[PDB]
Amino acid sequence: SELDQLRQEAEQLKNQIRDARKACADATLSQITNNIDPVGRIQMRTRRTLRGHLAKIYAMHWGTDSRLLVSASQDGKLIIWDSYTTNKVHAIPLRSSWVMTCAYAPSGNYVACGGLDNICSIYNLKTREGNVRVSRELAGHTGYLSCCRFLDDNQIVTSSGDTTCALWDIETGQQTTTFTGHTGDVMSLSLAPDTRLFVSGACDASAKLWDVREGMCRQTFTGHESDINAICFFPNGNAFATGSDDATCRLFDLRADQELMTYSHDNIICGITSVSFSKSGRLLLAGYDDFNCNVWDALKADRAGVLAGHDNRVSCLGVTDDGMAVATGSWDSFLKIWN
Amino acid sequence: RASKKILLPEPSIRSVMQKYLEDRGEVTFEKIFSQKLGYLLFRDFCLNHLEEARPLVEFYEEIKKYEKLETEEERVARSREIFDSYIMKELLACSHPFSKSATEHVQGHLGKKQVPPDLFQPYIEEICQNLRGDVFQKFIESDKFTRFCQWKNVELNIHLTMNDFSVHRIIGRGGFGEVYGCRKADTGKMYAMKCLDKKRIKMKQGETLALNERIMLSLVSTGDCPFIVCMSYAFHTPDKLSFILDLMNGGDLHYHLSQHGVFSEADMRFYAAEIILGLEHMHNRFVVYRDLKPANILLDEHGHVRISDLGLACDFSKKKPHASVGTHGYMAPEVLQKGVAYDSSADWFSLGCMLFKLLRGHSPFRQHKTKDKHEIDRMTLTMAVELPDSFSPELRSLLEGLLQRDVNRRLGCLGRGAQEVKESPFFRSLDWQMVFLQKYPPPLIPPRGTKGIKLLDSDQELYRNFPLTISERWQQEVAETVFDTINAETDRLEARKKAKNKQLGHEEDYALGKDCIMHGYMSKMLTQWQRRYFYLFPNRLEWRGEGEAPQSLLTMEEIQSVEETQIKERKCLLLKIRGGKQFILQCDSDPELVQWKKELRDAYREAQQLVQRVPKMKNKP
Amino acid sequence: SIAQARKLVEQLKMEANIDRIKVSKAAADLMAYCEAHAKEDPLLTPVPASENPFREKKFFSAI
Ligand SMILES: O=C(NCCc1ccc(Cl)cc1)c1cc2c(Cl)cncc2s1
Ligand SMILES: [Cl-]
Ligand SMILES: [Cl-]
């Protein structure tokens, strides 16, 4: 009937998209980058070990000053650290034990977090009174909060196990825009530098590019064979990397609308938990379930080096805005700063 | 005087205890208000810490004084007194006026000068209605419910040994052991301790008799009967079983009959009356005594009496017994006949036989001081009782009634039980409430001045469920001895700790503002025990030492199971941990053990159920 | 399902309606970005230990 005809038009369009993409594939990034020198052995070392969480660390996020960072943990706390000294600036006991993600406002005035409470909770740091307290609880999602990122002090984007992402106005506490499209749980998100766009990764094995202003899926990227656990924009906004349970990372270009590279090794069979680029985009850093973080030459696909300091899953990572340092968080309860 | 002291646990025990009670449905107005210690804590709260409930409880206690007045002349006086004075506050209270229905009922009786003890019962019902809503909810939030939990935790953790009693001289001897007078060290209350030796019990094959008495004491010991030797505690050591019973110093009525010689009708009337009320108590709880005789009647120091040994007694509520049990000369026809089932009917025949012996010096079916048991049993079934000319017509009526061979003809068996006996012409002169209150003067004041072996697992398991404490007995003991002083001392200790924690600056509660399920003290462990304070959250169990935040934990993911286990003597929890590790916990009381076992099991099962459907949190292949 | 299939066709129509550049040009722009920002990347191009807060840097600011 009507359904049979629309199932047949869905493949026609999908095949048109395949062939359009295939028409652009005139060379590989690997071929284009064959002339440039390798990076050589990158040998980063643990310069700080941050102790305080009593249980698994699930997420972290650097502040824009490249000094303070927030971590979120199974112990039901956020800790805000001064990486230069190892001192704690704030320990924040949360209302819900089940936190999964956290974020640091670009201003450094607010942090956010959430999890199986299904709520993104905003905390004011330097209050008019004195102490740290909840300024807002953002309810709306039907499932767990998996990731969140501030655009400014009044605006934050969220992703959920309900399969949606959303943009919030923190004053009203309402969803300004909803982003429907994903088939399964949404695991990670990443804002573009300019903030007009963002990307999400999901358990449907796909990444979607979204228009913030308009509220629509512009492009969808496939290739991964399993859940996408992490995602990160390339510094210039024209590309992003993903990390998956299939044991590969992948680079995608927006304007070419396809995969450029795969970062893989036969010996690496465990899942990727987190991803981030170095400041220039040349290095792609990924955390793994085998307790290591691997450092990939983003242009050539060679493994450049390893961060091997944790005794359980590396659950999260981040590179500073100034590029001086990498932070890893782990199920062993510690964060390490490397360079 | 109490040599030992009871120590209440800290107010923090509430977190555990409230939940324990809540899961049993015991946190209700009816459940708490009807307990002695619950009542006392509730009235304290209302009289002293909540002005809106004060007059309700004041008026309640005034009505209870009126209920206890013996004569109608007094009830005429009070009923006026009460209705005239301080009813005026209740009528003027906007929140609490008594109903038209209630007042019209009370004024109806009063207007006709009718003043029964339950004259003000309608006002009780409306007071309880007004006490069981918001007032009760505020009581539950108060430190007086916290204090109830502290007391309740002590009650539910009683483990008695011989060291908990100050034992004195032997005051009675039996086949399987002996009775001592003793003082309970906690409270200073004097008691009788019946010690039955287990090696003797096994030797003479009296296991069932010892256990039955234990069961029968349980059924009978509620309601505070002044005329039965009731139990407050049962406990046992490796070699002995122990019953803690009402102390009766005055010797048994067989001994006194042997010293005094026969009694007059007027002296027998006194003993008969008190004994009847004892049997009534048993029969309302569906217990047939079966061995009623002078030697099983004990005298206290003032000469008042109780019924003693319940080892041959029987619960007839579900199945009626038919076996020939009791003493020859006192057994009914329906008892002597094998195959014939009998109820409480047996005790009324026994009574008739005993009352006769008090007057004459022998059972009516014991002729010529004979020792032939076959003769005695046979006279019972066929011999008509030749009552002497000496006896009054009222007595003759009573004994003819009680000693009817046919149950359908017999007094106390025609439908209404003890009431049929109470209204027999012999007892016409007695006010039966005065009998109950032990107000009639006793006719006799007592003068003031081999080889056993092999106790195994098989035998000890017979007495697995021997230990018992009867709640109302314990609470009554506590209330009338040490309750007042220990409450005041604990108030002082808590105030000191409160004021000290203000001085130190550690005046913040880690359990608040989060999702803490429950918290309290437990002990963790290679040789020695480390006592620490634990907080249970939905994804983890944390703990701290004194003067610090928690710095260690277990997650609910790690826990594979939660099981009980004995280390040495005391029970403990065994947490089996992921990757073949273990964690042993020891609790400070039995309720705490039960609750921690339950809440941990619930918390780990629910957590592992949540995690499995969250990809970021779960274990990946 | 009728509604859900109609959303998809509309959505795929939008995805197909984009214009696309060559992978060779796209890849060339990424390579050029990296090369233009390599000197400013402290993980690629180490700084002296004296300007690195996690090695040997002497002075710091408040927070
Ligand atoms: O059960 C009692 N008498 C029955 C006979 C008896 C005596 C000792 C044992 Cl070992 C067994 C049986 C009782 C005696 C007392 C006392 Cl002399 C004092 N107070 C209470 C009670 S109850
Ligand atoms: Cl002893
Ligand atoms: Cl008395």
Coordinates of N, CA and C in Angstrom, one line a residue, chain A residues 54-56 58-59 74-75 77 93-101 116 144 146 185 187 203 227 229 245 289 313 331, chain B residues 510 513-515 537-540 542 550-553 555-557 606-608 610-611 613-620:
Chain A
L54 N 36.3 8.5 45.5 CA 36.3 7.2 46.3 C 35.8 6.0 45.4
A55 N 35.6 6.2 44.1 CA 35.1 5.2 43.2 C 35.3 5.7 41.8
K56 N 34.7 4.9 40.8 CA 34.9 5.1 39.4 C 34.7 6.6 38.9
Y58 N 33.6 8.8 35.8 CA 32.9 8.6 34.5 C 33.1 9.7 33.5
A59 N 33.4 10.9 33.9 CA 33.6 12.0 33.0 C 34.4 13.1 33.6
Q74 N 31.2 8.0 40.4 CA 30.4 7.0 41.1 C 30.2 7.3 42.6
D75 N 31.2 7.9 43.2 CA 31.0 8.4 44.6 C 30.0 9.5 44.8
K77 N 29.9 12.6 43.6 CA 30.4 14.0 43.7 C 30.9 14.5 42.4
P93 N 28.8 17.5 46.7 CA 28.0 16.3 46.9 C 26.6 16.5 46.2
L94 N 26.3 15.6 45.3 CA 25.2 15.7 44.4 C 24.0 15.1 45.1
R95 N 22.8 15.4 44.6 CA 21.5 14.9 45.1 C 21.3 13.5 44.7
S96 N 21.8 13.1 43.5 CA 21.7 11.8 43.0 C 23.1 11.1 42.9
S97 N 23.1 9.9 43.3 CA 24.4 9.1 43.3 C 24.8 8.7 41.8
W98 N 23.8 8.7 40.9 CA 23.9 8.1 39.6 C 24.4 9.1 38.5
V99 N 25.4 9.9 38.8 CA 25.9 10.9 37.8 C 26.7 10.1 36.8
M100 N 26.6 10.6 35.5 CA 27.4 10.0 34.3 C 28.2 11.0 33.6
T101 N 27.8 12.3 33.6 CA 28.5 13.3 32.8 C 28.6 14.6 33.6
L116 N 21.3 9.2 35.7 CA 20.1 8.4 35.8 C 18.9 9.1 36.5
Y144 N 18.2 8.8 30.7 CA 19.4 9.3 31.4 C 20.1 10.4 30.6
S146 N 23.5 11.7 29.2 CA 24.7 11.1 28.8 C 25.9 12.1 28.6
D185 N 20.1 5.0 22.0 CA 20.6 5.9 23.0 C 21.6 6.8 22.5
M187 N 25.0 8.9 23.2 CA 26.1 8.7 24.1 C 27.0 9.9 24.3
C203 N 24.0 4.9 20.0 CA 24.0 3.4 20.0 C 23.4 2.9 18.7
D227 N 28.1 0.6 18.8 CA 27.8 1.8 19.5 C 28.9 2.9 19.3
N229 N 30.6 5.7 21.3 CA 30.7 6.1 22.7 C 31.2 7.5 22.9
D245 N 32.6 1.0 20.2 CA 32.7 -0.4 20.7 C 33.3 -1.3 19.7
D289 N 39.0 0.7 26.9 CA 38.7 -0.3 28.0 C 39.9 -1.2 28.5
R313 N 39.7 0.8 33.3 CA 39.3 1.6 32.1 C 39.6 3.0 32.2
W331 N 38.2 4.5 35.8 CA 37.5 3.6 36.7 C 38.3 3.3 38.0
Chain B
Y510 N 26.2 14.2 57.1 CA 26.6 13.5 55.8 C 25.4 12.8 55.1
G513 N 20.5 15.7 52.3 CA 20.7 16.4 51.0 C 21.1 15.6 49.9
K514 N 21.1 14.3 50.0 CA 21.6 13.3 49.0 C 20.5 12.2 48.9
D515 N 20.8 11.0 48.5 CA 19.9 9.9 48.3 C 20.2 8.7 49.3
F537 N 24.0 4.1 50.2 CA 23.5 4.8 49.1 C 23.0 3.8 48.0
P538 N 22.3 4.2 47.0 CA 21.8 3.2 46.1 C 22.8 2.5 45.2
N539 N 24.0 3.1 45.0 CA 25.1 2.5 44.2 C 26.3 2.1 45.1
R540 N 26.3 2.4 46.4 CA 27.5 2.1 47.2 C 27.2 2.1 48.7
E542 N 29.3 3.3 52.0 CA 30.5 4.0 52.5 C 30.6 3.9 54.0
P550 N 33.8 10.1 55.1 CA 34.1 8.7 54.6 C 35.3 8.7 53.6
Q551 N 36.2 7.8 53.8 CA 37.4 7.6 52.9 C 37.5 6.2 52.3
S552 N 36.5 5.4 52.4 CA 36.5 4.1 51.8 C 35.1 3.6 51.5
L553 N 35.0 2.6 50.7 CA 33.6 2.1 50.3 C 33.6 0.7 49.6
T555 N 31.1 -0.8 46.3 CA 30.1 -0.5 45.4 C 29.1 -1.6 45.4
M556 N 27.8 -1.4 45.0 CA 26.8 -2.4 44.8 C 27.1 -3.4 43.7
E557 N 27.9 -2.9 42.7 CA 28.3 -3.8 41.6 C 29.2 -4.9 42.0
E606 N 18.8 -4.1 42.9 CA 18.3 -3.0 42.1 C 19.3 -2.2 41.3
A607 N 20.5 -2.0 41.9 CA 21.6 -1.3 41.3 C 22.1 -2.1 40.0
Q608 N 22.4 -3.4 40.2 CA 22.8 -4.3 39.1 C 21.8 -4.4 38.0
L610 N 19.7 -1.8 37.2 CA 19.9 -0.5 36.5 C 21.1 -0.4 35.6
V611 N 22.3 -0.8 36.1 CA 23.5 -0.7 35.4 C 23.5 -1.5 34.1
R613 N 21.4 -2.0 31.8 CA 20.8 -1.3 30.7 C 21.3 0.2 30.6
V614 N 22.5 0.4 31.1 CA 23.2 1.7 30.8 C 24.6 1.3 30.2
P615 N 24.8 1.5 28.9 CA 26.1 1.2 28.2 C 27.4 1.8 28.8
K616 N 27.3 3.0 29.2 CA 28.5 3.7 29.8 C 28.9 3.1 31.1
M617 N 28.0 2.6 31.9 CA 28.3 2.1 33.3 C 28.6 0.6 33.3
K618 N 28.0 -0.2 32.5 CA 28.2 -1.6 32.5 C 29.5 -2.2 32.1
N619 N 29.8 -3.4 32.5 CA 31.0 -4.1 32.0 C 30.8 -4.6 30.6
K620 N 31.8 -4.3 29.8 CA 31.8 -4.7 28.3 C 32.7 -5.9 28.1

